[PDB]
Design a protein around this ligand. Structure first.
Ligand code: MG
Ligand code: ZN
Ligand code: ZN
Ligand code: ZN
Lengths: 133, 490, 387, 107, 98, 95, 382, 88, 159
RNA sequence: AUCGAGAGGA
DNA sequence: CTGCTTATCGGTAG
DNA sequence: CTACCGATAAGCAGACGATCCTCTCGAT
């Protein structure tokens, strides 16, 4: 506890002392004759997809809420059809460092008529060793 | 991860700074630079013989760099060049272009005060090219006329000879980019000054900070401008179907449009005057692609925003090339975490947390000594701590240890490299910024610990100047044994 | 601050230059309760909560009565303003609206993100200030006034009343720097320019005590630089000025000066014809303040005094924009008419010109050269209620 | 040694380097009232011979320029008369070692 | 701080039209040498002339303020030992209660 | 993580140079360019696998050398080249 | 005075006093402010100046220069600051925060410049000190060719002491039955009495010790003995008389030559500059000079034989040890001092945060600019 | 002209002691070779660390490396890891 | 002021002296005065000291101030470090500033002087005056990313 | 991924 | 809170 | 006496400004 440290009772930590929920939100739109699409991706002459597993996405290209996400797991599967010289991947993975459970998923539309999505992921965070106070 | 060179390899010894000649620029290049376009010759997505390519680097990850071959990750990018019809001033040298034009008169182009003056005699003998030019300037800035003849030093009369026609020399001023003076108005054209330096005697160069072969005033103002290659101005962004080029590419387009804005007035419909209006903008862009911080106007739109960059502000101090990417680079094999202090550690020790240990690696050569522990290390793999990822073979091929079919095997031969996790008692550099010392930069011993902090000894608190109030701290890991020495011995 | 910008400031900024060249002349403004016309659909009453989820802008439509009912654009509405609706809603109503009862709003909102307008602080105009100058400076004291109006465009005509020559330095002249001008003018010429000709009446506007000889002695060297110019007509004449100014003048440069002293020289007080003594007293008051600090009877003016500083808040903040934005909409209709000479309204300009500024920080649209950049409108911050 | 007691008109300083090999040094009396080399800070300066120069220049293996320099109109250097090439030796006292040798070529 | 607010800013016009209708000699008709016992009057830093006996002018102003007839925002700065009286109606001054 | 200019300076104090070349070459960027023995710049066309290095204009075939410098340096020198300045690199100790 | 009233009231079981007694955290001011009173707050040197022209806050009258009106907090942090007090204290605190964020700013501009001005300055090999051009700066690093790492503070006995106390200490007169080495101190002491070949060697010792005292006092006019110097002789001596376990009751086995011609031949072996030519070996002498004062000094026939009695076996070791340690203290050709010299000044520069002379980083800003525009100029005439 | 130079074995002005930097990269340059399965010139007393061996080889003066010490003018002095004294 | 000075008995006794302290500076005319000791008069203006008493006095005077900057704040930095800094300033001939005007024009190789403040121009005139960079200094070898002539790389190992 | 802004950590 | 440039003044030469 | 040249004094203008770090937002 020397030099601006402190010792924290683990026992108290476990009964609930400084425990916290943490929520994060992920977002996506479509296009700006050429429109982006929401779907669980595949190869498709694309051979430029992300690293993690899309396996948590159903058919709309989104995760369901009950599921559990961790590491490079894809959250929003979304493909973009390009001619040009088919469908190039534009999927947003879960944050490199983050983990936890999907809380709510919002499917809506914007002023222009774009398929619009907001995914909320939730983690519980316990007072760990290097946490500031 | 490169190739094999009949050309030897050697340390750089000397660095010579000079200037570009029309002779060089036109022979050093392979590109021609004709059209102000970039790509799509009527929709045709390729390269085009205009600005990007004709014997230069490619974009679609192709070895089509013209026998330059081999991979973007190899071709430095030759270069070509852009034929400026009308001569064009240089930006950073406006100061000196004036200065020299204040030291040399008109018509013949000759030194103003020879050895005949008994003060200039203290300039042609002094060492250094820098202080010499500062000496001459002080004397030949008052005197105007080229002089008839004219002493004779030393002594009485009447006179001797040297050569020249006695015309008056103007009082030159700075007007944005042009040079205008008064005689007793006439503006000094770029064509007018090039012709003054195209001649000029051989002992006129050396007399004032210049060189016969390396740098001439006839090169100081720009005959033929060099065109920088693609690896200096990259491409796309957020499309893969809707372009999105850099920004030095935009400014070269502005010069190219202005260059064949004059030839469409020389060999085509030719007005006599108000064509000087176009000579300012073609000079302005080469005066703005090289610098944009002087006086008058900045720049702005397109296909982008404002103002502008213009090389120099890639060079200027902090976050630019020298002080940001050369003197202090960002580097691999490093880690950062909040520190907390440990009394049950030894002074020279540093608690590296487990997950960081699984991340950072040290290349170890397979030597008959370590095999027994090193092969176990391959078998443990990049998940369990005393393990390893990446195994490097004879031909420099990369075994990724966290994918692949043969990874729960691998018989390690001699002289193979194996990148391993960090194990206990390895020597690592461990600093805290702001780094005020040697002693904010100390080697440490490793003991892999649980929990996410870097653990370190309370008595090493002082030389790093740290609290536990949330101070984060950096750690660097060597990669050569020699370095591993130079860490624990220095 | 936002309620004053809607319930009035909006009104009067519309007027003024609205009248056009027939007579397209603007009038009242009706302001809706926040709506959003979404594509292939109806006009919808957008509540706070809906805006944030949907990445929309909680803005209402402006309507303005034009002359020989019309949509001008969309104004971002400050929450718990005026009609965030909300500012009407009872506690129970708030929960059903899925909006927090502890929410106090502040913050309206753009592209679904909540945005706060940050109070800006500058030095107040229309105050007389005296400033003792450094050592290598020829001038010793300077009386400065950032004269600028309150209801009529944005003209910042800064005026300096300098007092050259150090203590010791012989003959301390006083000159003043006028706006459109180029050189400095002795004050005795300024007065004579306004219409006060006889000295003594000059020093009456300045010095307000017959006994006070010390000040009067201070002004003796000024008069000496005057009696080159001993009549009104020639006092407007010594505004020249210098090297070359067109050439063809005399009767044209006199009328040039005769405007600068009414339109530019102290733009407050007034800007019209029949006022000359209203200003010369004020000018005399400046000289009184400048010399009152040169005799060291009163202190040099404090720069950090909070009562001579003003805060530009969300209201008059939006004013700055709306003035500029409304004039760009105005001078677009003037150019649509020009090509007509035989609908027209570009409502997006005001709509997106407010949104852009309120989204970024660059308070002034696409120019950014206005160094207001300083993160005017920041992204709320909701880590804890107290923050 | 010229000993003027007020000032020199610049038309006179240009007739100084006009008689080689002889040298003339102009000295003001306001600068000569007290001896500067007597002062606490100033240590003893000792001019050395051209034969000892080469001895310094070879035995420390230096270049003409590479030596620490002293000014031509330097207060001490004027007091001993140093032309270009002429080097001084300076025996300053130090809290690290009793003595320390310093050298300055006159530029 | 907790108590502080920003001035919203009223129309200056009813103050002007009040003063000139309660003594207050306009600036044009002012003669400095024969009325030195004069408090000059400022409104948003505009010199609207001079007032003789401001003592009773003050207590009438302060009462109108405290009653409501003059917007309670408007600050009324009487200088005793400088012979000035300034009335400010700007939109940005910071004020507090007490 | 950035190994700042201020951080370099501490490694210099320690006299550890082999580490500073490790940190500024092996980590970060290292690049293998190709200089003309005569003209001195980066003109040489790397016709590798075919042994050819024919730098035209100077008509060089044999007198061409390989060097190890950071890509930032190559970026620096190119930028200078484009700004009409020759930053030449020479192979031998003497001039 | 209020402080020191609270200082001599804190009992020995008082924890705050105990951490101060340890030097672990805190000091006297910390005590004074917490228990007694927090004192007079200051902004820009001067005590709280008027804002409200002629008064500090509108809670006071004008022209009030008394203590509380101009920002003196009579109460301690335990007692509580008052309404006014608190704002005053706030005004002070704020300046602290302000200048900190402007100090490190001004320091890191110092530090960077220093570092960039010295940089390439290293030793080498000719043990001198030079830059990239090979333009020499120092001919011997730090004027003595010693690394600062090894160096330590050591009193120079020759510098202090009375002319009466000095002889007593150092003079060995064999021709003088009241100033000879007692036959209890030396094996030969009684036979050494008289002798004219050993009273030209002792007169050689005592005369150099007196040339030293006139030489040191000419250097250190301060009268200060204690000076940074390599090799701790005091500790080599304490190592000698505990390694060889010497009783202080039986006489030495040293000769008078052993000592006197010992120290003079060790002096020859304290190499720093090595060149066998005239000029180098002349600077070799002019680098060891202070450390040889100090060793004679110390050691001194009288010292060695009477103060800390030494045997011939021990003394030969001591002499061997000093030469050994001395060669370890030399700067290593290659030491980069450029940086090291900057770093050593730029670091405490950062650790400066707040009586008329300009001081601190602001001054240091003039010094490193060679400023013609210096704030506080001053003659100091004697 | 290549070449000379060079400064003979007689008249050595340089410290006969091995410098801490000379030591650190002697160990360094050897541990580079030791790590890479190369002949060892001492008996290995149960130590396996490639830098640990270079230390033992140094204690017994069995390292065949030769220092070139460069003096500003250009001159160099050659010293073997046998003539040099390790004393740090 | 307090002085420590030798008594005829041998010891240093405390002998207090009278010392005058001034708010102005003109050493050219103050030491020339009858009464004061013109072998002890000191100024806190090392710039004047230089001008009057020679470059070498300029050193120590500049040292005394670097010293008082440090020691006034209860710190001690070892002589060699200040003494180095000080002397770098002095060895060019006059008082060389630790700013871009001083030590950046001083004939040093361009690349090294690049990595400072006037980055671009330094390169420019280097192209104009045909500067030959020596490449034996620190920054030059950092730019080219090579074994820098520093400690370790000051010499060169062979077989 | 680049540029431009602000918020916070030591 | 600083170096460089321009203008003005006193001095010498024809 | 007038004109030219040199020297000094005053007035105007430039090139940087702690190190690293983590996040959020908007844009051709
Ligand atoms: Mg803290
Ligand atoms: Zn290529
Ligand atoms: Zn000619
Ligand atoms: Zn070439």
């Amino acid at each position: 506890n020397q030099e601006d440290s402190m010792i924290m009772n683990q026992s108290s930590i476990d009964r609930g002392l400084f425990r916290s929920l943490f929520f994060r939100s992920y977002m996506d739109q479509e296009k700006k004759s050429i429109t982006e699409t929401f779907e669980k991706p595949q190869r498709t002459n694309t051979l430029r997809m992300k690293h993690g597993t899309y396996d948590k996405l159903d058919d709309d290209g989104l995760i369901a809420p009950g599921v559990r996400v961790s590491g490079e797991d894809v959250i929003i599967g979304k493909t973009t059809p390009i001619s040009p010289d088919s469908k190039r991947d534009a999927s947003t993975p879960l944050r490199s460092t983050e983990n936890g459970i999907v809380d709510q998923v919002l499917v809506t539309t914007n002023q222009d008529g774009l398929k619009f999505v907001k995914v909320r992921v939730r983690t519980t965070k316990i007072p760990q060793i290097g946490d500031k106070f | 991860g490169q190739q094999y060179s009949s050309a030897p390899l050697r340390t750089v010894k000397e660095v010579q700074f000079g200037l570009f000649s029309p002779e060089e620029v036109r022979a050093i290049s392979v590109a021609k630079i004709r059209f102000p376009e970039t790509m799509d010759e009527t929709q045709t997505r390729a390269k085009i013989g205009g600005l990007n390519d004709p014997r230069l680097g490619s974009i679609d990850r192709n070895l089509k760099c013209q026998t330059c071959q081999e991979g973007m990750n190899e071709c430095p990018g030759h270069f070509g060049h852009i034929d400026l019809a009308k001569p064009v001033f240089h930006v950073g040298f406006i100061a000196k272009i004036k200065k020299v034009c204040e030291c040399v008169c008109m018509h013949c182009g000759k030194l103003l005060l020879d050895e005949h003056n008994e003060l200039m005699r203290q300039a042609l003998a002094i060492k250094d090219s820098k202080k010499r030019f500062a000496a001459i300037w002080t004397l030949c800035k008052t005197k105007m006329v080229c002089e008839t003849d004219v002493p004779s030093e030393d002594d009485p009369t009447q006179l001797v000879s040297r050569g020249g026609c006695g015309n008056t020399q103007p009082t030159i001023r700075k007007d944005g980019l042009k040079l205008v003076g008064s005689w007793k108005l006439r503006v000094l054209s770029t064509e007018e000054i090039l012709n003054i330096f195209k001649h000029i005697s051989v002992k006129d160069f050396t007399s004032l900070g210049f060189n016969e072969v390396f740098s001439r005033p006839e090169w100081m103002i720009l005959t033929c401008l060099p065109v920088p290659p693609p690896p200096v101005r990259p491409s796309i962004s957020f499309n893969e179907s809707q372009r999105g080029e850099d920004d030095l590419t935009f400014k070269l387009a502005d010069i190219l449009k202005a260059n064949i804005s004059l030839e469409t007035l020389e060999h085509n419909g030719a007005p006599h005057h108000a064509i000087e209006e176009a000579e300012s903008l073609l000079q302005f862009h080469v005066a703005t692609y090289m610098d944009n911080d002087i006086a008058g106007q900045p720049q702005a739109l397109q296909k982008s925003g404002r103002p502008v960059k213009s090389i120099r502000a890639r060079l200027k101090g902090k976050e630019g090339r020298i002080r940001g990417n050369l003197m202090g680079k960002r580097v691999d094999f490093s880690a950062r975490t909040v520190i907390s202090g440990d009394p049950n550690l030894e002074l020279d020790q540093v608690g590296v947390p487990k997950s960081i240990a699984k991340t950072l690696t040290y290349p170890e050569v397979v030597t008959p000594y370590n095999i027994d522990r090193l092969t176990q290390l391959v078998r443990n793999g990049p998940n369990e701590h005393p393990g390893a990822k990446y195994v490097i073979r004879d031909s420099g091929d990369r075994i990724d240890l966290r994918y692949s079919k043969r990874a729960g095997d691998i018989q390690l031969q001699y002289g193979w490299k194996v990148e391993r996790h960090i194990m206990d008692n390895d020597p690592v550099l461990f600093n805290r910024q702001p780094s005020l010392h040697k002693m904010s930069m100390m080697a440490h011993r490793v003991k892999v610990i649980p929990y996410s902090t870097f653990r370190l000894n309370l008595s090493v608190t002082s030389p790093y100047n740290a609290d536990f109030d949330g101070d984060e701290m950096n750690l660097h890991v060597p990669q050569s044994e020699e370095t591993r020495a130079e860490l624990s011995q220095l | 601050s936002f309620n004053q910008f809607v319930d009035y400031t909006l009104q009067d900024i519309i007027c003024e230059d609205s009248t056009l060249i027939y007579e397209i002349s603007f009038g009242k403004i009706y302001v809706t309760k926040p709506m959003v016309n979404e594509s292939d659909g109806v006009t919808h009453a957008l509540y706070p909560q809906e805006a944030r989820l949907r990445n929309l802008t909680y803005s209402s439509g402006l309507f303005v009565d034009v002359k020989k009912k019309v949509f001008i654009g969309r104004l971002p509405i400050m929450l718990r303003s005026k009609n965030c609706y909300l500012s009407e809603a009872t506690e129970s109503d708030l929960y059903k609206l899925k909006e927090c009862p502890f929410d106090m709003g502040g913050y309206f909102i753009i592209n679904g993100s909540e945005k706060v307008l940050i109070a800006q602080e500058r030095s107040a105009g229309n105050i007389v200030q005296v400033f003792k100058k450094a050592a290598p400076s020829p001038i010793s004291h300077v009386a400065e006034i950032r004269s600028a109006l309150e209801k009529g465009s944005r003209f910042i005509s800064t005026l300096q009343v300098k007092l050259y020559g150090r203590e010791g330095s012989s003959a301390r002249t006083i000159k003043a720097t006028l706006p459109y001008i180029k050189q400095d003018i002795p004050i005795v010429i300024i007065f004579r320019a306004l219409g006060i000709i006889p000295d003594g009446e000059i020093l009456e506007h300045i010095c307000y005590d017959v006994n006070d000889w010390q000040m009067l002695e201070m002004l003796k060297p000024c008069v000496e630089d005057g009696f080159v110019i001993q009549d009104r007509e020639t006092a407007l004449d010594f505004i020249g000025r210098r090297g070359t100014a067109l050439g063809i003048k005399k009767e044209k440069r006199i009328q040039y000066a005769k405007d600068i002293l009414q339109k530019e020289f102290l733009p407050h007080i007034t800007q019209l014809e029949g006022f000359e003594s209203r200003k010369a007293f004020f000018l005399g008051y400046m000289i009184n303040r400048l010399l009152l600090c040169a005799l060291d009877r009163k202190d040099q003016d404090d720069r950090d005094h909070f009562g001579k500083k003003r805060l530009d808040l969300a209201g008059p903040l939006l004013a700055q924009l709306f003035k500029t934005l409304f004039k760009k909409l105005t001078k677009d209709i003037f150019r649509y008419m020009q090509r007509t000479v035989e609908l027209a309204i570009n409502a997006k300009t005001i709509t997106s010109g407010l949104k852009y500024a309120l989204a970024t920080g660059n308070w002034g649209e696409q120019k950014k050269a206005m160094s207001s950049r300083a993160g005017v409108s920041q992204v709320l911050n909701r880590y804890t209620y107290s923050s | 040694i010229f000993v003027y007691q007020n000032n020199i008109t610049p038309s006179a300083m240009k007739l100084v380097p006009s008689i080689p090999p002889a040298t003339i040094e102009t000295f003001n009396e306001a600068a000569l009232v007290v001896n500067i080399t007597h002062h606490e800070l100033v240590p003893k300066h000792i001019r050395l011979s051209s034969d000892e120069k080469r001895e310094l220049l070879k035995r420390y293996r230096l270049k003409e320029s590479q030596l620490p320099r002293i000014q031509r109109a330097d207060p001490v250097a004027l007091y001993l008369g140093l032309k270009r090439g002429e080097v001084v030796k300076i025996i300053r006292k130090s809290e690290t070692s009793g003595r320390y040798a310093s050298y300055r070529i006159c530029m | 701080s907790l108590m502080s607010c920003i001035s919203v800013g009223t129309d200056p016009m009813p103050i002007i039209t009040f003063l000139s209708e309660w003594g207050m000699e306009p600036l044009e008709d002012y003669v400095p040498h024969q009325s030195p016992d004069a408090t000059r009057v400022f409104v948003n830093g505009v010199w609207h002339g001079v007032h003789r006996n401001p003592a009773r002018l003050m207590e009438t102003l302060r009462t109108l303020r405290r009653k409501g007839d003059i917007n309670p925002e408007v600050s009324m700065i009487r200088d005793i030992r400088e012979k000035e009286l300034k009335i400010f109606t700007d939109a940005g001054r910071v004020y507090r209660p007490l | 993580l950035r190994f700042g200019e201020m951080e370099r300076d501490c490694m210099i104090a320690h006299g550890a140079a082999s580490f500073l070349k490790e940190r500024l070459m092996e980590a970060s960027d290292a690049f293998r360019v190709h200089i003309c023995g005569i003209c001195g710049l980066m003109t040489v066309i790397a016709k590798l696998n075919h042994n050819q290095f024919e730098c035209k204009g100077c008509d060089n075939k044999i007198d061409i050398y390989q060097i190890h410098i950071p890509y930032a340096a190559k970026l620096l020198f190119q930028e200078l080249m484009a700004m009409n300045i020759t930053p030449r690199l020479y192979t031998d100790r003497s001039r | 005075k209020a402080g020191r009233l609270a200082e001599v009231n804190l009992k020995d079981l008082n924890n705050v006093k105990q951490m101060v007694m340890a030097g672990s955290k805190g000091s006297f001011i910390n005590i004074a402010q917490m228990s007694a009173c927090v004192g007079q707050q200051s902004v820009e040197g001067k005590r709280i100046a008027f804002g409200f022209v002629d008064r500090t806050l509108p809670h006071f009258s004008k022209d009030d220069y008394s203590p509380e009106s101009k920002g003196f907090v009579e109460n301690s942090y335990l007692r509580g600051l008052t309404p006014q007090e608190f704002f005053f204290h706030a005004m002070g605190g704020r300046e602290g925060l302000i200048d900190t964020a402007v100090k490190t700013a001004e320091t890191g501009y110092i530090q960077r410049r220093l570092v960039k001005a010295l940089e390439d300055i290293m030793v080498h090999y000719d043990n001198t000190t030079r830059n990239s051009l090979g333009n020499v700066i120092q001919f011997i690093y730090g004027e003595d060719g010693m690394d600062a790492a090894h160096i330590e503070k050591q009193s120079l006995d020759t510098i202090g002491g009375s002319d009466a106390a000095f002889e007593k200490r150092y003079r060995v007169d064999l021709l003088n039955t009241d100033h000879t080495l007692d036959p209890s101190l030396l094996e030969s002491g009684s036979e050494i009495l008289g002798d004219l070949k050993l009273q030209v060697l002792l007169d050689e010792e005592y005369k150099q010790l007196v040339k030293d005292r006139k030489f040191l006092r000419e250097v250190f006019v301060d009268g200060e003995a204690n000076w940074p110097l390599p090799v701790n002789i005091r500790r080599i001596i304490q190592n000698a008389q505990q390694t060889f376990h010497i009783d202080h009751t039986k006489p030495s086995d040293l000769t008078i030559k052993d000592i006197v011609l010992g120290v003079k031949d060790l002096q020859e072996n304290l190499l720093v500059l090595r060149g066998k030519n005239e000029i180098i070996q002349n600077a070799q002498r002019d680098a060891v000079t202070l450390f040889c004062c100090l060793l004679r000094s110390r050691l001194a026939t009288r010292r060695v034989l009477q103060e800390y009695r030494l045997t011939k076996q021990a003394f030969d070791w001591v002499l061997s040890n000093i030469e050994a340690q001395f060669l370890r203290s030399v700067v290593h050709p290659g030491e980069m001092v450029g940086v090291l010299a900057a770093q050593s000044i730029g670091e405490p520069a950062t650790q400066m945060t707040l009586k008329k002379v300009t001081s601190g980083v602001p001054r240091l800003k003039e010094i490193l600019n060679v400023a013609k525009n210096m704030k506080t100029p001053s003659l100091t005439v004697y | 002209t290549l070449k000379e130079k060079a400064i003979p074995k007689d008249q050595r002005a340089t410290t006969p002691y091995m410098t801490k930097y000379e030591r650190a990269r002697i160990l360094g340059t050897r541990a580079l070779q030791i790590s890479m399965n190369a002949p060892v010139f001492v008996d290995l007393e149960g130590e396996t660390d490639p830098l640990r061996i270079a230390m033992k080889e140094l204690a017994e003066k069995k390292i065949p490396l030769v220092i070139r010490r460069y003096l500003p003018d250009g001159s160099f002095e050659d010293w073997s890891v046998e003539e040099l004294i390790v004393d740090l | 002021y307090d002085r420590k000075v030798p008594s005829p008995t041998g010891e240093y006794v405390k002998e207090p002296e009278w010392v005058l302290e001034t708010d102005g500076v003109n050493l050219s005319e103050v030491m020339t005065v009858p009464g004061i000791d013109p072998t002890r008069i000191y100024t806190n203006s090392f710039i004047d000291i230089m001008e009057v008493l020679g470059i070498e006095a300029g050193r120590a005077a500049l040292y005394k101030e670097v010293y008082n900057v440090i020691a006034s704040d209860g710190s001690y930095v070892n002589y060699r470090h200040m003494a180095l800094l000080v002397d770098v300033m002095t060895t060019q001939g006059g008082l060389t500033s630790v700013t871009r005007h001083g030590f950046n024009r001083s004939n040093t190789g361009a690349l090294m002087r690049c990595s400072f403040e006037e980055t671009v121009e330094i390169l420019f005139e280097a192209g104009a005056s045909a500067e030959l960079d020596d490449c034996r200094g620190v920054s030059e070898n950092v730019i080219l990313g090579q074994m820098a002539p520093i400690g370790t790389g000051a010499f060169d190992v062979m077989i």
